[PDB]
Design a protein around this ligand. Structure first.
Ligand SMILES: Nc1ncnc2c1ncn2[C@@H]1O[C@H](COP(=O)(O)OP(=O)(O)O)[C@@H](O)[C@H]1O
Ligand code: BEF
Ligand SMILES: [Mg+2]
Ligand SMILES: [Zn+2]
Lengths: 369, 360, 333, 246
């Protein structure tokens, strides 16, 4: 009757248990947050584990006879019993009173459990944004914009990605002060305008839960949390508050002097500059001339390096000294064959873009000279 | 047949049900209604004064569908989820449990994430004065620029240990220990609503024994009901308070001064039944005499430590010449000197009080 | 440079922001208010964002130095706030500050906050490097003599009418705790929009949050204010101060006073004060103490102090506050 | 200066087996200083290694083929741990030197030296039960797996299991301060009276780990006496587990 009946081989239960064991750290803020929520319903077992900030749920199909139910069981206990059985063990878990009875041949366990209804409240989510996209684009967005995320900053909002979910072009933006990275991809369907800031703990988990396959990535975004969906595994992450500086407002609109250069040669030059770079402010200067890029590396130890790059330019003479890491990681994320860019004197943003596509862009500001 | 504990069953649910702390309630209401709520509110009072109750009511005011206001509503979703202790984003932290700077940092990593429900993510830390200095500095650093929907509630019994810099970040409220009148009236209301037969003198004894704390009054009321089968008479409360009495040294001084031998004997026998160490009793008797001498020298010698028995101490200082105080102090000093080598100290203390009574 | 007080910085800030501001003082409230005013004026003049760094033996000087040459992608201007330690700078921190001073430019409204530096720290390369145009603001706590005037002036500033009795009560309850004093003034303004804070109106909304040092108690004993001395003892005990340091300062100044009283019949008080290196501000107080205190009272005070220290150092430490109050009363007769 | 009271010329793998048989049942910083070590005993052509801590006993008695006078010395825990740290699984003929106060070992190209504990090791013979009538013989690996399964939920502060012995089935029951129960059943061949006996599952598991055999025999007397464990097909080493109170 009130006996959540459950029966599965341990092979189909080992991996989902490990998947839902992520948020379960050492000491949970709430006591019940140190447990797993087990639900047998509609011929499916749902495993839920939460950290009051992120939730991971794994679903497994059920073929053995069962009775629907729900119960919250100790995390590390249940995992230890499930893992400690011999290979091929057929675990049969039942609910008697307030106890999980785990039976397997001649082995019997009676674990103490918490009511299912006392596990926070994983409801009230009325998502206003819902979209499914291929894995390649989801990976590419964060490949493009992960480097430019600020970490351990007083401004909380700078520590997370911004998914700009508006119109049809889905965008991801990450600005670490001077560094700005934006990437736009068409997903297929129109949708209202939203700007959602996802914490680093959310995107770092997203990257581990994206794998190659036929996954549609049914992403549901609400006002305070974002949720991702693979067919068997689903994930939830809260959102970091604060506003966000408008990337489009700091994009160079008026100026039009364009510079073109290769990628790999710039890679080698900037990597050589980074080797034994400036001790304190590891940034170097450049003099842009007509179809010419001179780069100088200066150090507090008088160390000087000068190189000349043959490029395409149709503008004026400018002198601009940046931080090498910023442009290095910008080019690394852009990963194209040739880069178009613009940079002007005084205080003006250096824009870097793929010469073949405008789906991604980067903004870097030099230092004082 | 519930018969639940009257302490939490009668915790205030609306601000109008809080006894005392009227200025604090007015300030909170004014901040909630017209002004902009300060980013951090600290509470400091005595044991059983209302601190956590006020903080919980303020958090209820913060998160509610009616909006951020003083008296939001009744039986709403957020108000009920707080009253049942099941609210998600109403974080309740014991500072002593998380004095470590690492645990504090982990706690302060949660402020960035948005609230799950309501409007504001409210943190309620109890006994905040026990936080380590590094954890306290981290708390100040997160309080200088909090998120626009993240608020902190702090409580502590003794705010004197808090560094002054906490005043630079949070608005503090001090809750005055309730007097006999307010505690007695609240207990009378509780008993009237619970249909408990009682007498006003019993309520007065309970309130005086409470020493300003309403939680103490409620606990003593529960004990009185338990022993008296609901019939809370004056004699029952008096007897069960005498069972808990520990003012033996003061009564001994009063009776020895009054040359009341039989009273001193009864009180010393009661102290023996209490199983009190005799050396400690004699040294605290010496301390009481010294305090009487000092308050005779100047009225300001007294403090708030003896603010429970200050009336009798003032009377003793007024009525007793300093020469008698010096003689009694010398007698008790020599009695304590000779106590270890005496017979069983229950009678050594007796005979020292005898020598004191001899100066009649 | 330009050395000012909190009441003058507000007028100075409208004359044009300088290269750097040094907020020096032991009062958290004055430092906080001056920093807030500087930040507000900077925001009015175009400084949008601000960066805070506490100077620690593990300070990321590379981060701050890069911040000197860190431009602003979306922002335009920037400030830079430094929180000096309680003991001030040393060789390494002062060299870093000298380099930072060399790194100032049109932007970088460098703000420096901490406690007042010593004469040795005064004569330093970094301090002289910005010694042409920086603005230094003294933010020391007003003492007992000037506290009533200060609280009356602030009440006038806050559009609050205060009485002499209310001023005395606020100075008594919140001495050395002007943060709590301003919070109390704001609370009284909020509770009573009338503004006429009578004595009963302030008696019901203040709590004993004053903070004292052992030197405050020593000065109270020397002046002979028994009530003030007992209040200081109560505040120190509630704060949890170790009685050993109270006994140590008491012993030092009492031995000096006993020497002075013994030599008074031989040499005039002026030369005795001069030989014993007595500060000018306390010479009158100590002369008054010498005049009031007799040799018998000094011997009794030494006896009681010796008994108290013997009680403490024998690992008992029981009811030492009663003995301290006894000594306080004895020295105030 | 050395007077070899007892000199062994013994294969190093042999003493590796000897020490590994009894290493775990040893006292660490125990009050009884004589137990903070391991007893080397010599009886004719037999070398014996005994180690106990008051809750466990482990004796390994192995013939060596060479006759020596009877002797008994105690080598401290540090010395035997160092020897195991240095002892390897090779063919070098190890040479043990036993004097009045010191232990020495010539091992190929290495020398190991240590002092001896000044004390008398207790007589292990009386520790062994004198009426080993009841016998539980079962596969070693099955017992190890069952005990590990029953000890999954056992806590470090509360480590102990009750054995219910019946006609055939052996029941291992484990509880915890959290008040949750674990039970395992085995088809051990047995014939005797039903009984209940509690032991620390860690000690029993260590005993089974020391036995690299296909099956073991446990000798039992009653519910309050110690239990012996041995190889069902060899008598080279025996183990004693003292029961726990319930
Ligand atoms: N002002 C008050 N109004 C109503 N009940 C109170 C009040 N102060 C204390 N109590 C009672 O005491 C119990 C505990 O109160 P609490 O506010 O936790 O005291 P504390 O200041 O020591 O944390 C409450 O449940 C309530 O019953
Ligand atoms: F909860 Be109180 F401070 F007794
Ligand atoms: Mg409390
Ligand atoms: Zn409500």
């Amino acid at each position: 009757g009130p006996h959540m009946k459950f029966t599965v081989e341990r092979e189909h239960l080992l991996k989902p248990l490990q998947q839902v064991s992520g948020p379960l750290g050492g000491r949970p803020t709430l006591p019940i947050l140190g447990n797993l929520l087990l639900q047998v319903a509609d011929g499916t077992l749902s495993l839920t584990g939460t950290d009051l900030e992120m939730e991971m749920v794994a679903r497994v199909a059920l073929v053995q006879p069962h009775e629907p139910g729900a119960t919250t069981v100790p995390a590390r206990k249940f995992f230890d019993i499930c893992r400690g059985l011999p290979e091929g063990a057929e675990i049969a878990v039942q609910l008697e009173g307030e106890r999980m009875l785990v039976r397997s041949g001649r082995s019997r366990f009676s674990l103490s459990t918490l009511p299912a209804a006392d596990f926070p409240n994983l409801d009230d989510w009325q998502s206003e944004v819902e979209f499914t996209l291929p894995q390649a684009t989801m990976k590419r967005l964060i490949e493009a914009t992960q480097f430019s995320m600020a970490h351990q900053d007083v401004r909380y909002y700078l520590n997370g990605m911004l998914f700009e979910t508006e119109g049809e072009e889905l965008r991801t933006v990450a600005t670490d002060g001077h560094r700005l990275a934006v990437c736009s991809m068409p997903i297929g369907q129109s949708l209202p305008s939203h700007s959602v800031i996802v914490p680093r703990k959310g995107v770092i988990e997203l990257m581990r839960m994206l794998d190659g396959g036929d996954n549609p990535l049914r992403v549901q975004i609400g006002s305070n949390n974002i949720r991702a969906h693979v067919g068997d595994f689903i994930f939830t992450s809260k959102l970091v508050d604060g506003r966000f500086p408008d990337y489009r407002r700091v994009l160079p609109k008026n100026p039009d002097k364009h510079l073109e250069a290769g990628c790999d040669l710039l890679k080698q030059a900037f990597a050589r500059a980074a080797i034994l770079s400036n001790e304190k402010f590891r940034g170097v200067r450049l003099y842009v001339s007509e179809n010419q890029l001179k780069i100088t590396a200066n150090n507090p130890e008088q160390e000087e390096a000068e190189e000349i790059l043959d490029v395409t330019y149709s503008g004026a003479e400018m002198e601009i000294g940046f931080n090498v890491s910023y442009v290095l990681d910008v080019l690394n994320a852009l990963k194209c064959e040739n880069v178009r860019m613009m940079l002007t004197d005084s205080v003006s943003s250096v824009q870097i873009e793929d010469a073949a596509s405008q789906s991604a862009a980067y903004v870097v500001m030099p230092m004082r000279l | 047949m519930s018969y639940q504990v009257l302490a939490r069953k009668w915790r205030p649910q609306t601000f109008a049900d809080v006894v005392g702390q009227e200025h604090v309630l007015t300030a909170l209401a004014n901040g909630l209604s017209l002004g902009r709520i300060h980013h951090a509110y600290l509470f400091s009072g005595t044991r059983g004064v209302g601190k956590t109750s006020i903080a919980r009511l303020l958090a209820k005011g913060l998160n509610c569908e009616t909006g951020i206001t003083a008296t939001p509503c009744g039986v709403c979703d957020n108000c009920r989820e707080i009253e049942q202790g099941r609210f998600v984003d109403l974080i309740e932290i014991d500072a002593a449990s998380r004095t470590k700077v690492e645990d504090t940092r982990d706690l302060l990593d949660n402020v960035q994430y948005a609230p799950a429900r309501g409007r504001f993510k409210v943190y309620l830390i109890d006994e905040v004065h026990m936080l380590s200095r590094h954890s306290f500095n981290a708390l100040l650093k997160t309080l200088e620029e909090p998120p626009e929907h993240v608020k902190f509630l702090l409580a502590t019994t003794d705010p004197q240990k808090l560094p002054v810099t906490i005043l630079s970040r949070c608005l503090q409220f001090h809750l005055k220990a309730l007097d006999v009148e307010q505690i007695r009236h609240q207990l009378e209301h509780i008993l009237n609503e619970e249909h408990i037969a009682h007498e006003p003198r019993a309520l007065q004894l309970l309130a005086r024994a409470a020493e300003g704390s309403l939680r103490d009054a409620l606990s003593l009321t529960d004990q009185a009901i338990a022993s008296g089968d609901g019939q809370v008479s004056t004699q029952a409360v008096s007897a069960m308070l005498g069972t808990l009495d520990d003012d033996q040294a003061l009564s001994l001084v009063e009776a020895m001064v009054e040359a009341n031998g039989e009273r001193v004997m009864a009180l010393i026998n009661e102290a023996a039944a209490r199983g009190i160490e005799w050396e400690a009793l004699l040294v605290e008797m010496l301390g009481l005499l010294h305090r009487i001498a000092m308050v005779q020298l100047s009225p300001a010698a007294l403090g708030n430590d003896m603010a429970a028995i200050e009336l009798r101490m003032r009377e003793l200082a007024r009525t007793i010449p300093p020469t008698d105080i010096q003689l009694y102090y010398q007698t008790l000093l020599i009695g304590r000197k000779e106590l270890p080598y005496a017979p069983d100290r229950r009678m050594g203390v007796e005979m020292t009080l005898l020598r004191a009574l001899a100066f009649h | 440079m330009i050395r000012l007080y909190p009441e003058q910085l507000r007028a100075q800030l409208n004359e044009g922001l300088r290269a750097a501001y040094l907020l020096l003082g032991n009062d958290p409230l004055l430092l906080q208010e001056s920093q807030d005013a500087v930040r507000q004026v900077a925001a009015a003049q175009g400084f949008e964002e601000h960066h805070t760094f506490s100077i620690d033996p593990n300070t990321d000087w590379n981060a701050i130095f890069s911040l000197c040459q860190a431009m602003s992608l979306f922002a335009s201007r920037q400030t830079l706030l430094l929180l000096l330690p309680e003991n001030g700078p040393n060789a390494a921190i002062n060299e870093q500050l000298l380099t930072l001073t060399g790194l100032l430019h049109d932007d970088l409204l460098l703000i420096v906050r901490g406690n007042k530096l010593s004469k040795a720290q005064e004569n330093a390369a970094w301090f002289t490097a910005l010694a042409n145009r920086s603005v230094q603001v003294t933010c020391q706590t007003p003492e007992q003599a000037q506290l009533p005037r200060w609280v009356a002036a602030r009440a006038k500033q806050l559009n609050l009418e205060l009485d002499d009795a209310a001023n005395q009560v606020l100075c008594y309850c919140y001495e050395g705790n002007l943060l709590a004093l301003a919070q109390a003034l704001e609370r009284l303004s909020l509770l009573w929009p009338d503004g006429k804070l009578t004595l009963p109106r302030v008696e019901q909304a203040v709590n004993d949050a004053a903070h004292f040092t052992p030197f405050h108690w020593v000065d109270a004993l020397l002046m002979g204010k028994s009530k003030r001395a007992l209040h200081i003892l109560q505040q120190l005990r509630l704060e949890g101060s170790e009685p050993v340091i109270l006994l140590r300062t008491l012993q030092r100044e009492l031995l000096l006073l006993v020497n002075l009283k013994r030599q008074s019949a031989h040499t005039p008080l002026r030369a005795l004060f001069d030989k014993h290196r007595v500060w000018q501000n306390r010479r009158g107080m100590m002369g008054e103490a010498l005049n009031r205190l007799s040799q018998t009272q000094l011997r009794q005070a030494v006896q009681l102090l010796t008994r108290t220290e013997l009680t403490l150092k024998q690992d008992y430490g029981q009811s030492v506050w009663a003995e301290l109050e006894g000594l306080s009363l004895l020295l105030c007769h």
